[PDB]
Design an enzyme around this catalytic site. Structure first.
Site, mmCIF file in Angstrom:
data_model
loop_
_atom_site.group_PDB
_atom_site.id
_atom_site.type_symbol
_atom_site.label_atom_id
_atom_site.label_comp_id
_atom_site.label_asym_id
_atom_site.label_seq_id
_atom_site.Cartn_x
_atom_site.Cartn_y
_atom_site.Cartn_z
ATOM 1 N N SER A 103 0.877 -1.134 -0.129
ATOM 2 C CA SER A 103 -0.127 -0.065 -0.074
ATOM 3 C C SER A 103 0.734 1.372 -0.061
ATOM 4 C CB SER A 103 -1.010 -0.108 1.249
ATOM 5 O OG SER A 103 -1.745 1.107 1.151
ATOM 6 N N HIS A 206 -7.693 2.665 -2.130
ATOM 7 C CA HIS A 206 -7.424 1.682 -3.265
ATOM 8 C C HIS A 206 -8.809 1.355 -3.982
ATOM 9 C CE1 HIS A 206 -3.155 1.303 -2.711
ATOM 10 N NE2 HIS A 206 -3.422 1.581 -1.371
#
Length: 314
Positions: A103, A206
């Site tokens: 991430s 995301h």
């Protein structure tokens, strides 16, 4: 950032893992700060990032750290200080190196793989968090972990409820993301033989709900010096290595609204015969996953400098 490609006399491969969000701890910079050269770098970066890092690493509450705008640079800060010492110790001399970040951790991985400079990365992590936070105030969204049953059943279910598999971390480890109302509906009734836990995050990372963050992130991403990698650098998009700097930076940006396919990163690690794994602070989760998904490969979770020691030979 200048090196000699080691000679093999006539596998020696190590994974370096950079952590994502959701494991940053109350006292996470204390073991690193009292080391030589660290204070200087932090003030430099803290000013560079325009948020107070030295304070927020020592006597800061987990609550003011669970604030994406603070969390993100702070995670990256800790990872790089830790790698910085590992390099300095020369422990990785003559090892083939593969790097993957989760991430946010991609920013720190990119720096470890020598695509961006340590200082620039922290600054870009600060922008990421700040921009992402604005996006969260648009629509009440979030993410909820789904420790799972049947992979097909779980994918079919997030479809119905219009949620993205935002992280695909392991077999049976899925993060769902989207509107808080739809996630409450997931919790209210999960797909059989599976669990749901609403990760305490300020938005649906995301997913497409991060559009507003895109321009702000791209702008800083562009204004940054760049170099072609010094390690095999993996991308959360598909877990393939990245060859060019331009490619990497493109992906990094567009990864803001795309699923973190960390599972496919783990797959690529296997097909490299990684002999050992090092996770950087705040370490824990990624090494946990590697213990389960990568049989018989030693993995270390760096918390303090004392852990970088029994790596001298591997």
């Amino acid at each position: 950032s200048s090196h000699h490609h080691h000679h093999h006399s006539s596998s020696h491969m190590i994974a370096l893992l950079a952590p994502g969000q959701g494991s940053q701890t109350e006292g996470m910079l204390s073991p690193w700060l009292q080391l030589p050269g660290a204070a200087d770098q932090i003030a430099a970066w803290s000013k560079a990032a325009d948020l107070d890092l030295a304070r927020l690493g020592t006597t800061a509450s987990t609550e003011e750290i669970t604030d994406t705008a603070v969390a993100q640079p702070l995670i990256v800060a800790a990872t790089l200080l830790a790698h910085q010492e590992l390099a300095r110790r020369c422990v990785l001399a003559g090892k083939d190196v593969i790097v993957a970040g989760h991430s946010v951790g991609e920013i720190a991985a990119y720096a470890i793989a020598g695509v961006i400079a340590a200082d620039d990365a922290v600054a870009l992590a600060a922008t990421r968090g700040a921009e992402m936070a604005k996006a969260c105030a648009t629509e009440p969204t979030g993410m909820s972990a789904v420790l799972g049953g049947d992979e097909t059943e779980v994918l079919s279910r997030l479809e119905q409820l219009d949620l993205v598999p935002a992280n695909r971390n392991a077999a049976g480890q899925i993060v769902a993301a989207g509107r808080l109302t739809a996630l409450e509906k997931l919790a209210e009734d999960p797909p059989a033989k599976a669990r749901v836990r609403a990760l305490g995050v300020a938005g649906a990372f995301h997913t497409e709900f991060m559009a507003p963050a895109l321009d702000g992130f791209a702008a800083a991403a562009a204004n940054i010096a760049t170099a072609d990698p010094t390690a095999t650098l993996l991308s959360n998009r598909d877990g393939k290595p990245v060859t060019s700097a331009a490619a990497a930076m493109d992906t990094l940006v567009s990864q803001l609204t795309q699923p973190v396919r960390w599972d496919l990163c783990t797959a690529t690690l296997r097909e490299h015969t990684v002999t050992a794994i090092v996770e950087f602070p705040p370490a824990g989760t990624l090494s946990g996953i590697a213990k389960r998904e990568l049989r018989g490969v030693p993995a270390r979770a760096v918390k303090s400098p004392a852990d970088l020691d029994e790596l001298a030979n591997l």
